[PDB]
């Protein structure tokens with residue numbers, strides 16, 4: 001039997017850079033919300049202990065793909081405690097709708113969905129806590145996706161606190177440029193002294209993304225996408241870009257702006273949700 005699992009995108013509703021660690025990593029205060037939109041992952045169990053990703057993801061080698069790294073990591077960890085049945089394996093395929101990076105966390109979501117799905121299908125019985133712990137080694141966004149709830153993140157992104165921000169409708173655009181996360185974080189003009197604040201304060205303050213000024217300055221087309229969207233609604237960068245989102249109260253307004261917007265915005269409309277579609281589908 002084949003099973004299908006959601007792999008939703010996320011948005012950083014806000015993102016503040018508070019400083020830099022001894023190793024150059026940046027400490028942050030950020031808010032995650034899921035989009036009811038993303039990739040779909042299909043799994044068929046194997047009994048020969050093999051992991052086979054049947055669908056190539058543009059420019060990513062089999063062993064480099066987060067789907068495969070997640071599956072192997074779970075296999076190894078579960079086997080360490082004797083919680084992996086002999087012969088456990090899987091054929092995996094993905095319907096990839098999300099862009100590469102862009103600040104939507106697509107790869108991290110793929111990894112999280114795989115961890116949760118295989119844990120379930122192989123009957124390993126690991127807790128979401130255990131999955132999120134191993135998931136962190138694959139990236140700070142992974143635990144958020146694994147845990148399934150909108151969350152405020154601190155430290156370098158590893159310290160999570162579940163929260164319940166307003167759920168809005170979003171128009172998410174992407175001009176086509178692939179911005180590598182490290183390119184933004186290494187920029188000399190990037191703000192790195194935003195004061196650390198309490199969750200209560202951050203939730204009542206205007207939402208913004210500290211990376212946006214840099215993204216706009218260095219990528220003309222990101223600046224243009226922002227210019228166009230700001231004509232219609234509050235809009236900002238998510239993650240380190242290049243994706244930008246515009247906020248709306250209803251689906252109808254969002255979709256009407258999408259029809260009006262330049263086609264090169266490559267936009268899609270999706271509802272923000274505080275419970276991940278992955279966990280929702282498991283109810």
Ligand SMILES: C[C@](O)(CO)[C@H](O)COP(=O)(O)OP(=O)(O)OC[C@H]1O[C@@H](n2ccc(N)nc2=O)[C@H](O)[C@@H]1O
Pocket residue numbers: 012024025026027028030103105138139140141156157181182185239240
């Ligand atoms: C900023 C976010 O996109 C918010 O959703 C994520 O927290 C990014 O975290 P991540 O994807 O786990 O980090 P990666 O994309 O693996 O890191 C790529 C590189 O970005 C830089 N980096 C990333 C995260 C961080 N808090 N400070 C940094 O200076 C580091 O040089 C790092 O080596």
Ligand SMILES: [Cl-]
Pocket residue numbers: 147148149162
């Ligand atoms: Cl949680």
